[model samples]
Target: DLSASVPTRPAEPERKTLADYGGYPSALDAVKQKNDAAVAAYLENAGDSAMAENVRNEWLKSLGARRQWTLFAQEYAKLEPAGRAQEVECYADSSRNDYTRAAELVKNTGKLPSGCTKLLEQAAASGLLDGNDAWRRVRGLLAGRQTTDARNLAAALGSPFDGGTQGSREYALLNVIGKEARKSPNAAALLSEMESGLSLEQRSFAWGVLGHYQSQNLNVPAALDYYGKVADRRQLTDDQIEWYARAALRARRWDELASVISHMPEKLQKSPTWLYWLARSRAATGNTQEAEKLYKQAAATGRNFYAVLAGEELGRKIDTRNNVPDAGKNSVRRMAEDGAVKRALVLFQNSQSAGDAKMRRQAQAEWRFATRGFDEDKLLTAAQTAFDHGFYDMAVNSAERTDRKLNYTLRYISPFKDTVIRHAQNVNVDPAWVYGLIRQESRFVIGAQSRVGAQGLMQVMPATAREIAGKIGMDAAQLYTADGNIRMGTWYMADTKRRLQNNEVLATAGYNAGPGRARRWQADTPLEGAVYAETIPFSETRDYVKKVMANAAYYAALFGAPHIPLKQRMGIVPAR
Candidate 1:
């Protein structure tokens, strides 16, 4: 029975598309063909909906691309702030020769549309950007790995270099640093030759870049060595300073970590992350009084990775049982009776019944639309009702909206508890940890899927599911079920923990960003768990690991598990 062949899915008739429903099939064709008349007809008839807004943006993009400045300006005036895309704004500002505003827009470092790139070049050519602004843009470009663009802007500096032009030599030095930081083992040696012409600020930045790359590569000694060369930490960017701090922590350089934390921007220095880290640095260096004060400040955020650790250091535990207010007896009836709420519930039911991912998103949109303008009381009611009806994701979403009167029950609803517990037990993993991971992965949405094709409650990838299915003796198709996903996901979790010396911190990081990367992130010597978690290279994975671990602490307390501190659970991470 276990080895039985699976049945093939039946082919259904063709489904109607959103484009067809919007009556814009021909207009989309016209957009491609550059036929303005047809697009104009569609814009005139377009109703106010999400798709209609999209049509307007598409038309704006086309008009801007065609260099029809007069018509583009006229059409752009009709767009709401929400509908105005960056490229469209670039084109509009370029058309009006507002290079000042356009420069502000292009200052952000990421890859841009062709129009935005052209606008940036045009603005630079207008002589509006001074040396500081030019250097700032070049740094952004280098950060985004757009070395060619950085070089062009450097050439446009137009002053004398090292017996040549002003910005050119510096750009040349930075360009080499950018490339070498990515791969070359001899980046520091190569930079020795180019150091003579660079300013202290430029030299500091180049070393910071080298340090950041080394930190990301998990070379703690080399990273710290590179960072030690910087004359002024303030000359480094915020990201570079962050990496420098991380390198200091990995190497257990308490004084350096404390120093780097001080050099951080005020906003960053006050954040829970830095507060907790600075406290650790203080404690390590025998400033217990200052450390305790910083710990309380960090712990004041209620519950998070850093907050929980800070709380544990002061002998406090996660507490979600304080000051939760009721949403009134008739609140559910009032929410259910509302016309928009009723329609949203019906759409949600339809989405749950149907297998279409598109319909699920439509339901989410409807729910969002219905929930607009709702205050704290109504939001609580909506969350409670959604939870009662098995709309777990909606419940969490609604609960997250309330500014006050916090309700952990609505936020961390436990559905299919018995199944999750049993599956987790079978794999010898903690059920609360499984629940915590699910909370972050899908908020317990059974049909949930990610952009990269991770599916169901656990968000397990299809390839991973297939591999686990064979090892565990189950059909991969079952991964969509509450039972199978938890089973396979827990098994995978257990395996990672086993390989990573039962360190949940490593396992949690592995779950978000691959086990191999988790292992690679380990220092050559044993590292503190908090430091390991804080230093993860990927921003998304770092945040994910923190939230997931914090969720586990809350879940464990909710499940009546003996109060185990998150720091103890995290434990010490061994060297790779």
Candidate 2:
């Protein structure tokens, strides 16, 4: 339920006189007596619009820092709605003031300005607002006593904005209808209307919602029809298509389900569930060999959940094998002797990277196995090459792997001290976290590419990069550039930090699985932090969260914060 009740705004304290502070002269004496009107006038007449904006921003920043919600709302509302909204979002994340007060201030500041409201409504309707303030607002409306308002909000959320994809629309409708449908019948109508309004590519979402509702009502035929609609839509996601295929099979429509499964894209057809269904459909129609082949394909996907079930279906034991093929020892040794390998080893040994000492040692030990019997000359040459190319961390890592300590020139030291450190501190994030993410994502390779088409040091997907760029007011085209990727990644990390109560574990989880998913997981099952972490269903996500937290901890230690373990730093453990 939405916590919409506004608390009383605290009264502003009287302005302190210079004499109040041990009779010392105040730094702000020049502007101490100026009224807001006078200050505004002076800034307006200063003939520097940029400077004026800076001053306004600084004032808003100060008000936000002090938790002066009344002043913030009053002053911020005076600006353009877009600007005000940005300030609100920024304050929500970075303000040193009380968060509960900030939430109340924003919630009780009357309805959002018309322009901002329009923007939010569109985002909500399209599901582009997932894990954002707009989604939260809609959630509050649906859960609270404001059914009418929530209904109106849903209605106002018309169509997707320009270039909005079907995925976004589906996501939004899923939230609104899935979370609110039982409480608000109007939600169903709203979803149906939205479905009617969608382009061909977007209508599968409507069908998905209809299928969900029909399933809930035990209307098997109606559910099957909706599921069929999803299957027929070319734009349906693999998950959607698989769901629909399963629904058809559940309804005992073997022929229809078989046709749908056969038409699925190759990758989708190979999914464990899809293969199981294909096998089931074939078996039901008396085609044993095809069913067996499909069953084997299903078992081959290595998804333990479905593999176990597939094993039972085939009446044979399933054996798990290592996914990574074994590189022969000589080949592995050659790989270890490569420049990249030596550089990585040196970086690990010098404590230049963000991993913990234990992890670093482990990495070094692995390098030894991979590069066993490589001579010192080859290692030194590779390390020197890394240094010559200005990859200081790589050189240091390589050197350390070989138990060599090397001196770095002042030229190498200057930029590390001045630029990287300053930028990291300015963003209030551990430099080691940034470095670690970059290392894992791209290994300092400027033009790295993932199989899924993620690119650059941060391995940002194009779509994600575009969305993040737009939010930060940067041009999307720059996302391919190293500077742009780093900036957006860091900004997004900072944003995640704010949303997760500065909990790195949760924030990292949000970064991978989305904030909305993280929130739902949190709300559905509130547990003691460690216990909850251990219970995460998604093994990849669970491992990733733990690794990222561990990485952050090591970074903290390397930067002279040795007592900062992940649990303590994230405030997940109860205070002693």
Candidate 3:
């Protein structure tokens, strides 16, 4: 059974590590290649440790995705407790058309997928749903493009087939527009007839769906025409409004994009994303001062993609000056000596009793709990104490809660910048970019491991590290160490830059996202940096590219290259 073993804190500490475990680092490569026998041996040897659990999760998820169901079933059932074995089982039920089993499996899932939609229909059709739940099935059916299944649902609910009457027909059509649109663009012809018949709340979503489908099919002109007839948008959903703006941006309709964004709720307009784009769109017209105001506001919102683009627009970059606190060692000592702080330490230290992952989690929890009610000054001191104590993740977390008095030293502190800098220079990589990545990926947590098995300060995948290890003549032992992780990470970074047309932005994007996705995001022709950053398909990768570059800008300033404007530093991202 899955059980918890809380970690403890040490009176004093020895050098700690969360990097790859002892020897056989290439054994990670075997894990990547699905050498299950070897992977099992590794996890077993780890004695149910956190690292073992993570690698196990990564393997099981991979097997599930590839439809290696037999292998997944065989391996996943052995997890200490359930460990997402439920998800694997759910997939198994769905795959076999075991509707009753599938329905029970996903009873608690928040958002039902299309596959689940099919099973729900099967359960309803067979009257196999023991309780005969009706609306739940209907609600899930109406959730996506599965509304074509609604005819039977409406029948089950005593609604007339095809609405037999004009008014009833409108609801019937409205409910299925989602499914209808995917099949025919001509279905929009029904909108004009339906809108006047329905309420604002009703028609707005239907019209938005039609518009989305039209734009998705590369018919923005057609979508714009539909947009022009939209008299009022106060009733439009947030998703609908954003969809309209996205379509305008796709078609390069700057005027329409600006108008659509302006019509959006003021809260959305002020968001960094829309604010940056709003600035860009207005500048495309003639509001230089207004655009600059917007850009400056966007730039100061903190270290993010839009903020950096805004900073680049204003010819500035964030200052990464290490504002080392004036507090003496006595002050640091006092903060660290607090009962709560000491308790957090004990918890994190004791986490070693069970595993690294649990230690990190409980340590974070205890630290957060200890400082939950701390005053601003104490919070700052607490953050500095964590920094001094080498709890970079906790320091960053505590500093983030302060909101004002953001100690950049604590918030964006480098875990191993010295080692990273040397490795970066050795591999012709920019050290700032590496730090930005580390900040975003793990917040300087040396033992950080993503759910997907990416590990260490750099979040390097064990499999990728193995490939790079040979290329750069590295061993697994070196890789899990700070110096080793950075060395391999930057070597991989150098290769990503090379493979993606020598574009640093693409390289950064490639690093967070995949190279394949980065190539897809690249403009067929040179694209403006801000717009490109704004429109990145994946929100995480978009932020990654922006923050990494922006982080580099600040690091450049901190590392004595402050003279260069961030704009030039962010130079054109060039055509694919």
Candidate 4:
């Protein structure tokens, strides 16, 4: 029987070409004109010929990439294989708009040929191009497909394609392996590779993964050991170091955690998490006074979520002292009796009535002593003294009592106005856009930084800022300065606006995300503007786009340009 076995035949390759499918150069060129009349003219003349089908496919592909989804959908069903695939991909990535239509296209493409499936899968893995909709589409495709395809799609879900240049590969590896680890033992190979190949950020992420896995498996000692290694390393960030300290605390190794944290660089002490953990460990070791001092420092920074915990502790101390009714009343009355304090209180009360909920809450919290009848003039003097001594919070509290808006203006906006206005004018952008960006980026604080290392007034990434500066013939080092920051930021904004056809919605999105990503998103889906805004995959960018737009709208109104609709200002003309 073995000797009689026949030789198996190789599968034949499918015939395909850009020309055979009507993907001729002439057809594509006509589509590129992007005029409705030209597109209509091309479509009408092409007829039912194979050349027509090919031309349609080419047209769809071009439009898909440019985010002409609405037009693509109008003629979707009439297109051929290539066109259908392009349609699916276009919708999948256009999350900001037409998510429903994108989902529907993906659903329709469920019966795509193997090659088409592969193309879509690769696109789905590209995070900058694909949103959660692509993930869902890929998952749907893999539902009844072969195991190999399933695993590939699963791996793509965790792919780290958008971690910027420094750690993107490691990020991708971790994403793939971390999710896959739960289902199979394939993680060990990835872990080994990562341990050997990744840079510091990747290594940090790997350690985090290992620690997470060990913790999930209830291997407490192993988890703590991994955390200990990361904590002891001098190269780790303050946030990373804090994580290690927290792990040590969980392990009840209080003394070790305290020693580790105490020896951390002084710059790290200002980090809310590090300070909180250090305080906790200090208190656990009976260093209550030092712990309280650390707690107060942590509270002052407003960087820690547990800052309120520190406030609660301070409140308890105050409550214990104030339990003496007559004494507390006399102390409060003396503060209220002061003319300066009384005037401040009046302003504070007015602000509460006129301000937004968030502002009112901030004002009330800062002026808590005002309602307690404290010596108003003394409180004002003390607050001013605190300000002079660099007690920003205290100074802010005192200023809030008299004029919340003025206080905010003086403390945050005043110093930055010239820079803001200059940058806005230079870019030919609205000053409101700059103000909104500044507010969101750093709350008007000069040196604010995000966890991922975006910095300064506009929270520009160093790499991006450097690239922009270089393009404008400026020194990258200059980005650290206020003028340079605003200048580069405005230039970048202007660039985005041009790329997006002055569409503020698209331009703002491009600013927060990237121009390439924004362009890709538009190419993939046809969606209503609001839906697109609401569903932008990156939470931060989505919120930023909304807030900046809203802020810009307010600024326009404040400046008496009340006739400009946000959509119009953003240059998003509705399709006829």
Candidate 5:
């Protein structure tokens, strides 16, 4: 009776048996062996596991490799549309002559498999993807610094750059300008000499390209000069116009900043960022009434860094109350009862119990599939359900998707508070900032692994973990644990801050994009932290720093520390 009442040790979690995934390995092996009959035999017995789906996907690709389009289409159609491979889809779309869909699929600049490449070639042959499409792809490639690939593709459109004809000569000149503009520090004279050979539209594009490069190189004077050579603002791409504005802002040319903002596309002009900056430009140029008007418009968003900055400029902090009601039990029950959600929860539990990253990934996919079309309330309920079930990452992701019914608690849930704060205190780092970085890094997923192989809560890279662990005298393998990760991450943050002159903005940027890069991005003169953040040449790092800083501010407020304004938190990035 005492034993029954005492709750003796909780039973160990049930381990997955061989029978549970009996045919999975064989099915994969069958696909490798090119035995369709064997693949079919094993696949059906493989159960409904995510790895089984991988086998099925591989078989479909094998069918495509054999040019068995009919079978491939049938198998692909039977698979869930959400899980279909883009490469296989491209092949299917090409086989059906659906150039419209195929063109859309191939627009991404990411590396593609041969099947997707073939689809693109077929689309080009069908006259759907033309020189403009190639140019667009080249622009993206150039932005990513894939110059050789961009040149190859640009040259592949032969008539546009060959034959010595007038159209050919114009296109050739355009190509030369783009190539020269991509070079560092010395392209101006070459581009200027070639400028007269192009039409006004082409000249504008060429100069805009040069301005983009110059801005990235931190030569704001040259960048502004190049931008001024543009014959038509409309001819410049959105990215080019943005860099033009950034160059003006970096140079403290208030009138030019205002002019650039005014000429921006309507969508950009109406956005909070431009609105706030436009207000700043007006105020700097002594137009108080116009600045106030713009500030009011910008502050209406009542959210984000720019909006908060605008509000403070008007003598108030914007209200960011967490007034949304908690998800009701009935809503969570309904979500839990759904078939996909039920399966996902089981997988999540199993993954946690067994420390299986693969199962966790499957659970995440299942959760996404289950909640695909959920409305705001349903999503909030799902987030609640996930949080209750110990799936912190899913909770944050689900809460982040809600357009209304804002719930910061779920969006910024602090899962490992004791571990994070203790480690931060040990390293003399701000726990709020640590929480902000962790939220961005892994969203509180314990076993999260990034594409670049960063693992655990802090998303610490393996090499960095090893290095940090050595200095701290801890086992590197312990990085998988919460305390270990936070310890290493906190120490690293402290070290980064020291190396970066104790500037949190620089340290934060360095944490994301490496210390050398952070140092390199520093201006030759003292720069406003916001401007430095905006002028980061790498788009990913720029966005990351902005979010990390914003998240830190929210975290600081939530942690009940003295309310430091976002601008003060950013401070002034000193000259290198």
Candidate 6:
């Protein structure tokens, strides 16, 4: 579809339809079919409802796509603002004048529509988009979950800063492989049956997609076959290639692993995890001298799971880098005296702050603004202050900025200590694992709640809490309390661990994602835990597992238990 300069929208429906399907909304299909009259009727009936609002956005997008701005303006005026609507609004802003208003509309969004490039550029020259660089703009486009937009822009411009059409193709083709392949029906089989009409680039994209899907399903031999057919390495995203590399590595296709790593974009090759795996591949393939060199490279990246594993490969201990200097005693006092920190303290301290989302927001705003000009030293000072004040979230934010230390105390704090310890002990759970999970979940913010309503320190969702409430002899309401949340969290975490082969990695992932997902992550053939961790398809859960497991490793050392050898903690992930 390289010739597909303007991608086609699906066919419009020719008839009217009702909104509900046996009481469920037919909103999705009607919108897909572009049933304008039915959509209008659905909206006339239930415009204020959430489903109708969703339907409205879909209609608005189609109108925008077909360049119907007169109708766009009328409907857009009545509709609730959404990200998709904003894109169409950008189109509307450009189709007419209000250049300054256009600037404001796209201030956060990156890339002007191809239709309005000159106008937006004129505004950019007039002092809008002040701090946004090309890379920032690229990130903004991607951040809106507009991977398709990013690909289109990258196709027009180069990726990053001018990756050009070929470079842009990388984003589209790369993303397509990972997620698009998962959705495309029998993609591997379909690729085997493909014909001669498509361009080489289009055909390459198909093979790249099948390569990702096959490898992700642990079908490395088929994946490798498909990957070899896809001649252009430029067609894969960094993550898509990482999965490609994972397939190669697991099959002990050392030569192929080296080749994949060799072709990977320069930035991804230097990551510590890949570096360690390359070392292993090198040694296994009889390049021990080069392997040691790579091993040393991995070990030098400070204390991390891979760094520790890399160290063990060369007979080095997991170096804690415990040489960081402590912050001054006056740091805490200075932080308390600072106006924003004081305001944050006051806002959160007031008993009324318990469910007061707005006051807490103001406090968050103040604390963030307070540290704007902080240098590394000041960041450490603020971190120490945050730790002393019992504000775990601030402690995390501040400590992560310091170059002078890896401030684990602030980063991995275990508050609600007695309560956490009590419940974890009753379940015969490792307290450190609970602490690590809590650190990642809420950063120990007692009032932490997710956008999806995971509440309190342990972030137990209301339903999950209710489900576990009866067995634990606690009510669902208690999950909002520090006491009940930690208790429910530990119970769920522990039980999920038991269910998922008692593997800590699986348990941690199951806690954040789902136990079903964790079970599915195990390989058909036994996978090393690192392999399982690395190939996790969901980006959020993959990163979550790494941090939680790494946090657990540090917590084990801190708690003085049977110290978990970092890799040993990851352990062996088993097949069903």
Q: Provide TM-scores for the models.
A: 0.83, 0.33, 0.66, 0.34, 0.80, 0.69
Worst 10 residues of 3 by lDDT: 1-10
C-alpha RMSD of each candidate structure in angstroms: 7.9, 22.6, 11.5, 29.6, 6.6, 14.3
Ranking by TM-score: 1, 5, 6, 3, 4, 2
Error of 2 at 36 (Å): 83
- What TM-score does candidate 5 get on C-alpha atoms? 0.80
Task: State the C-alpha lDDT per candidate.
Answer: 0.76, 0.49, 0.64, 0.51, 0.75, 0.66
- Per residue, candidate 4 scores C-alpha lDDT tens digits across 1-576 of 001111121211112211222233454577777655565666674424334454566666666666676876766667644334554444433523323333333332134544344444554455423443443333333323333553454465564235353224533553323444522445544555556666554454455545544443434476576555442344443333444554465456778778767756676667765676678778889999988998888766631134534544555211111111121333334443343333333333444355433332223332343323323343344444333333334453443353211222212222367677877897798777777567557654454457787777777888988899778899887777777888888888888878876666777888889977665545232444533454354657766776676555444444444445544444442221
Give the poorly placed runs of model 6, Cα more than 4 Å off.
1-200, 319-322, 339-355
Cα RMSD for candidate 6?
14.3
Global local distance difference test of model 3: 0.64
Candidate 6 yields a Cα-based lDDT of 0.66
lDDT per residue for candidate 2 within 480-524, as digits (tens), equals: 776777777777677876786665556666676676655544523
Question: What digit string (tens of lDDT, one per residue) describes model 5 on residues 356-442?
Answer: 786687678767866766777778888888999999989988888865577888877888786788889988888889888888888
* Candidate whose TM-score is highest: 1
Model 6 TM-score, all chains together: 0.69
Q: Which model, 2 or 4, shows the larger lDDT?
A: 4
Compared with the true structure, model 2 gives a TM-score of 0.33
Question: What ranking emerges by lDDT with the best candidate at the front?
Answer: 1, 5, 6, 3, 4, 2
Better of 5 and 6 by lDDT: 5
- Count steric clashes of candidate 3: 8
Better of 3 and 6 by TM-score: 6
**Error at 109, model 5, angstroms:** 7.9
How far does residue 208 in candidate 6 sit from its true spot (Å)? 1.2
